[PDB]
Design a protein around this ligand. Structure first.
Ligand SMILES: *CC(=O)Nc1ccc(NC(=O)C*)cc1
Length: 134
């Protein structure tokens, strides 16, 4: 047999993700991480798998690790913020989305109104959660 490289495992996971096989993709990214745990994008990609599978604590842990390895990552701040938003950690989520936005502008990766839209939605969900209380 052949043992694929971590990079090959990441690409295989990407094809599994494109194939909408999210548990399988997550496991493949996990094999990539085992082969080389110092590459942030393996964790961010697996985090997105876990968000598609609504496995929040696993996504959260992966976003934290990705950001330890690449503190400049637009994607990992965005996914961290999305995971926090879904766990109703609103203020943390918003701050991570604002950092994703600022990093994206700096890197010229701010596409359309995407991250500002995520920020508006996060802020409105936070606002609704307070406004709806008795
Ligand atoms: C390749 C891939 O994952 N594409 C993709 C396209 C559209 C969406 N949008 C929604 O699910 C709303 C997700 C993934």
């Amino acid at each position: 047999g052949a043992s694929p490289s971590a990079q090959e495992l990441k690409e295989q996971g990407n094809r599994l993700f494109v194939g909408r096989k999210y548990p399988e993709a997550a496991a493949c990214y996990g094999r990539a991480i085992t082969r080389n745990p110092l590459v942030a994008v393996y964790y961010t990609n697996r985090a997105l798998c876990y968000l598609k599978m609504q496995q929040h604590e696993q996504a959260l842990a992966d976003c934290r690790r990705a950001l330890e390895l690449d503190g400049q990552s637009v994607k990992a701040h965005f996914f961290l913020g999305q995971c926090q938003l879904e766990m109703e950690s609103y203020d943390e989520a918003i701050a991570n989305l604002q950092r994703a936005y600022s990093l994206a502008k700096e890197q010229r990766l701010n596409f359309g109104d995407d991250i500002p839209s995520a920020l508006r939605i996060a802020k409105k969900k936070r606002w609704n959660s307070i406004e709806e209380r008795r």
